[PDB]
Amino acid sequence: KAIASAANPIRLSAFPPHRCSGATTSVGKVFPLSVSLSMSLISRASEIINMLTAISDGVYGKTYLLVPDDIERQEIRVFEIGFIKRWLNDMPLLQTTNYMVLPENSKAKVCTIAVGELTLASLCVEESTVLLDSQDGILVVTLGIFGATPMDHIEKVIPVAHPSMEKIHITNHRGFIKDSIATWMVPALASDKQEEQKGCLESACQRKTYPMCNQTSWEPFGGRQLPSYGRLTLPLDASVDLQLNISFTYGPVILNGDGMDYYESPLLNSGWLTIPPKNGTIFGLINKAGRGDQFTVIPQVLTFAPRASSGNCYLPIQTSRDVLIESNLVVLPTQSFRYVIATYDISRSDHAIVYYVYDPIRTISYTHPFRLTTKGRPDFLRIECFVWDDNLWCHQFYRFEANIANSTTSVENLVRMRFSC
Amino acid sequence: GIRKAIASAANPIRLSALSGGPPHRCSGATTSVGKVFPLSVSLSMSLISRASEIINMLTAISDGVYGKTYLLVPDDFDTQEIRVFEIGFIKRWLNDMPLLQTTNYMVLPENSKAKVCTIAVGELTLASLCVEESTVLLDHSQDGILVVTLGIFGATPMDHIEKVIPVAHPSMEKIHITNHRGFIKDSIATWMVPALASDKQEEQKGCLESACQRKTYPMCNQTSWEPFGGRQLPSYGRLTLPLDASVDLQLNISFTYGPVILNGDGMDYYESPLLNSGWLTIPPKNGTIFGLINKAGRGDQFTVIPQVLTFAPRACYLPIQDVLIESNLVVLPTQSFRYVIATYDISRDHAIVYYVYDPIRTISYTHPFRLTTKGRPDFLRIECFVWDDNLWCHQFYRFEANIANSTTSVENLVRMRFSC
Ligand SMILES: *[C@@H]1O[C@H](CO)[C@@H](O)[C@H](O)[C@H]1NC(C)=O
Ligand SMILES: *[C@@H]1O[C@H](CO)[C@@H](O)[C@H](O)[C@H]1NC(C)=O
């Protein structure tokens, strides 16, 4: 049934910037049409919380929390998967083909998201901090592209971690599925090389002050415990039951533990481990992350995480605006290296969702704002971008509370950006 | 999983079986409580949400699978209007509400002249017959019909877009395809349409003339009957389409005379508890020229025999002669024979009031749905089903507002409960 439900949608499985400088003109468009469960719920004024979306090979997959309408049988975990079909005017139309709801006893307050090979993968936990280490387990959730299939799984798995990791911090994490293997990246904590790396970092703050070497509480885990990079591997082989291998490695200093996405890379058995910016002081990060046997995290852009002149550590480059929320880091599925970040900007007469597309090799950055008829200030912003007909498309979902209203509004739509002279 | 048909059948027949499951009189007044369920993951509902106009949406519901066909007017030679097909499930949402989720859809280009298309669903498949002109000739552009088949998911051998020349009985002359719901059973899609034939005409001219020989009806001065305008009465035509891939597609057309047909603008066909049979219903017409329900054979024998809503003058049958529009007589998918019809009533707010007739107990329930909007209607279409032993109806209507210039389309699910 797997290969039959795979032969059916291959029919449905069918450069952005300017090559030179000068004046840059950016034209944007919002495409509102969508056959998605999430957008239908948003139209009926239902409240969607923390929608994480992953797009890969023409298949899309969302996970989010639904706030019900006087119903408790207090939030509901929902998974959604479908296609990106070509609508009239060659517009990308997201059509849901399968979805699934969890009851509250599977406790899925925090869930990851990944799509690929007509499958949706998600790791769910009630508390964000998982101990490694009464054994703390993770809820593995897999959903097929269509109907009820052996592809579907709802199991509680005990992770197989390296000795010795202590914790991981699961918040908002996009992974991806390739070679029938789902991979995520999360902030981790381990005993190995902990004092050595704080020692190398402290020997780095003897030559240059950073807003971290006096910090008594580092980001993901309270106290002065340095976070590492954790790699969550989940095979989708049916030969044996599901097991979650967790690896760890030190890389650039992690200053944001509230998000760590992972995008596929043109290099085989490698990927882009990205960390979003926060508070206006923590820069975003892009790292080369290995997904094979050896797990190595090495920076791609060398100016937001340069290596220290002495030792095996990196420099925690930080900063001592009218952007309220900003997230996340999306590496575009292009052969040329480009990444995107969207901000909720209030510097103009109207509020705007302003996209920044960085080409860091040539040190150029394009920008385009999407002006909002509504006004208010957001608590969440999430982008997932893809290329469609030589154009940059982004699925954006943001959640904001209005200045004049009492309730919190959720917004979700597709946007396109073109860049010319 | 060697064949996609049975693999794409093992996955959703578990989900089409999710739908599993009218009191005994009442002392005094009988209370009916209604509800509108607006949530839907349907392409048609999404298009309506962006104020795009959907025209002539025919919907068929069967075994937990739904299927729509309609015309979409976009905003980008003749018109242009776009034929759209849609098929999906009725999944159980929170609070056990019926949620229509599209699982596959398809759009036709304009070299397929598909202005008029029938609709039928069953066995995880959507079947449709398409023509530009409603009148198809079967005589001597040699009239073919566009067979359109759509699978439950993705691109499958179930999908077909072929233009077939119908194989009719000798000799039928015409059929009139407008708004016709059929259904798919035993890998056969069946529709019923008004037909025209040479044979055995004298029997019904004699019964027809003998009906007004005691009482005048606005029918015995008629020198021209409706669908084909000629001086010969239309008959009942049965369009049979096998969906087996064992043989290439062939459109079998049979015909039989039954109760006198006075309305050629619609003829729907619902499944019946009787083996190899179904319920052929004909919609009402303005005034009180009402619709009729007949038992129609679906096997080797094609017989159309009146069930309700036709009287007998001499000892054939004839139909009975503030509601602005009304079409579509729907037989409920129950073991007991019950049928539904909803009207656009303006006697009150405006309302869509459903009438559910249970003739065995000689009882009829009614319920109005008051409209927040006001205006005058151009189209009304209902398709009803049972969900948790409750009466649900998918309704789509098209009306022109007092305040606008263009016509607005509305589509939603309604439920009706009856209590004491
Ligand atoms: C993770 O550990 C398990 C158990 O040894 C193994 O099956 C799996 O291959 C490991 N993953 C990697 C990437 O080494
Ligand atoms: C359809 O027509 C062909 C030839 O007239 C015949 O072999 C077949 O039995 C017919 N089937 C039905 C259901 O009418």
Author numbering:
A (entry chain A): 161 to 174, 183 to 241, 246 to 305, 311 to 497, 502 to 602
B (entry chain B): 158 to 178, 184 to 238, 243 to 306, 311 to 485, 490 to 495, 503 to 529, 531 to 602
Which passages does the manuscript contain on this structure?
CDV is an enveloped virus with a non-segmented, negative-strand RNA genome that is classified in the genus Morbillivirus of the family Paramyxoviridae, to which the measles virus (MeV) also belongs. CDV has the attachment glycoprotein hemagglutinin (CDV-H) at the virus surface, which utilizes signaling lymphocyte activation molecule (SLAM) and nectin cell adhesion molecule 4 (Nectin-4) as specific entry receptors. CDV-H consists of an N-terminal cytoplasmic tail, transmembrane region, stalk region, and C-terminal head domain. With regard to viral entry events, there exist proposed models in which a conformational change of the H protein induced by SLAM or Nectin-4 binding causes a structural change in the fusion (F) protein at the virus surface, leading to fusion of the virus envelope and the plasma membrane.
To determine the structure of the vaccine strain CDV-H by X-ray crystallography, the expression plasmid encoding soluble CDV-H head domain was transfected into HEK293S GnTI− cells, which lack N-acetylglucosaminyltransferase I (GnTI) activity to modify glycosylation with homologous oligomannose-type sugars (Man5GlcNAc2) and was purified. The molecular weight of the non-reducing soluble CDV-H determined by gel filtration chromatography and sodium dodecyl sulfate–polyacrylamide gel electrophoresis (SDS–PAGE) matched its dimer form, indicating that the head domain of CDV-H exists as a disulfide-linked homodimer. We determined the crystal structure of CDV-H refined at 3.2 Å resolution by molecular replacement using the MeV-H structure, which shares approximately 30% sequence identity in the head domain with CDV-H as a search probe. There are two CDV-H monomers (chains A and B) in the asymmetric unit of the crystals, which have only slight differences (root mean square deviation = 0.301 Å) in the structures of some loops. Therefore, hereafter, we focus on chain A as a representative structure of CDV-H, in which a more extensive electron density is observed than that in chain B. The head domains of CDV-H of vaccine strain exhibit a six-bladed β-propeller structure, which is essentially the same as recent cryo-EM structure of wild-type CDV-H ectodomain (r.m.s.d. = 0.584–0.743 Å), similar to that of the MeV-H structures. Furthermore, CDV-H forms a homodimer structure facing the β-propeller 2, α1 and α2 helices, resulting in a dimer orientation inclined to the horizontal plane, similar to the MeV-H homodimer structures and distinct from other paramyxoviruses, such as parainfluenza virus 5. The interactions at the homodimer interface are mainly composed of three parts: the top, middle, and bottom sections, as shown in Figure 3A. The CDV-H structure, which contains five N-linked sugars exhibits electron density only for Asn422-linked GlcNAc.
